[PDB]
Design a protein around this ligand. Structure first.
Ligand SMILES: Nc1ncnc2c1ncn2[C@@H]1O[C@H](COP(=O)(O)OP(=O)(O)OP(=O)(O)O)[C@@H](O)[C@H]1O
Ligand SMILES: [Mg+2]
Length: 178
């Protein structure tokens, strides 16, 4: 089972923390969005446009379940996987690290806000606020560790996680005797 499954909004650090944590632990890194593309030979966008969100979620759930079973390293989940009840079921029992971020920081860390075409319509910051409102409660539900990334740089985030993922060595005593 993965050492850690990372979940969070866009810009929360799934890629950055994924790499740095996997480096610190000396383990493999798998991202479920990349894994879907690798297993199908189709872009995420194409699967959505062509098959619809529900079939994307189906493919996604199979990939997530396989990775939870087979991957021993760090796993990062695509943002919407937790919307599938079967994915929430599959995660139960795993180490699930929720990288927390505010709307303002999430927008900044994903390229900033956009020009607003119509005063009466929404801008990028407002769309992000909507995604947060819907996703954040689900990340909270599935989490076993919550880490605020708003005021910690990536090195600090990784050190915080490592301090809470420790594994005692069962052969520790004997090692000192040989
Ligand atoms: N703890 C942090 N403090 C400050 N900046 C950060 C932190 N974590 C990540 N960043 C920066 O925020 C940006 C987005 O990070 P990253 O791509 O890792 O997020 P992500 O969760 O993978 O996003 P996406 O869901 O779009 O794949 C990058 O420029 C990265 O350097
Ligand atoms: Mg990423």
């Amino acid at each position: 089972a993965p050492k850690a499954v990372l979940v969070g909004l866009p810009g929360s650090g799934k890629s950055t923390i994924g790499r740095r944590l996997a480096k610190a632990l000396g383990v493999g890194l798998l991202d479920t969005d990349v894994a879907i593309e690798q297993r199908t030979g189709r872009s995420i966008a194409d699967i959505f446009a062509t098959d619809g969100e529900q079939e994307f979620r189906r493919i996604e759930e199979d990939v997530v379940r396989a990775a939870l079973a087979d991957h021993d390293g760090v796993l990062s989940l695509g943002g919407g996987a937790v919307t599938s009840p079967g994915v929430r079921a599959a995660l139960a029992g795993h180490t699930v690290v929720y990288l927390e971020i505010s709307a303002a920081e999430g927008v900044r860390r994903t390229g900033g806000n956009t020009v607003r075409p119509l005063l009466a319509g929404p801008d990028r910051a407002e769309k992000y606020r909507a995604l947060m409102a819907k996703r954040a409660p689900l990340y909270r539900r599935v989490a076993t560790m919550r880490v605020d990334t708003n005021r910690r740089n990536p090195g600090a985030v990784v050190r915080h996680i490592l301090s809470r993922l420790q594994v005692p060595s069962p052969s520790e005593a004997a090692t000192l005797e040989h």
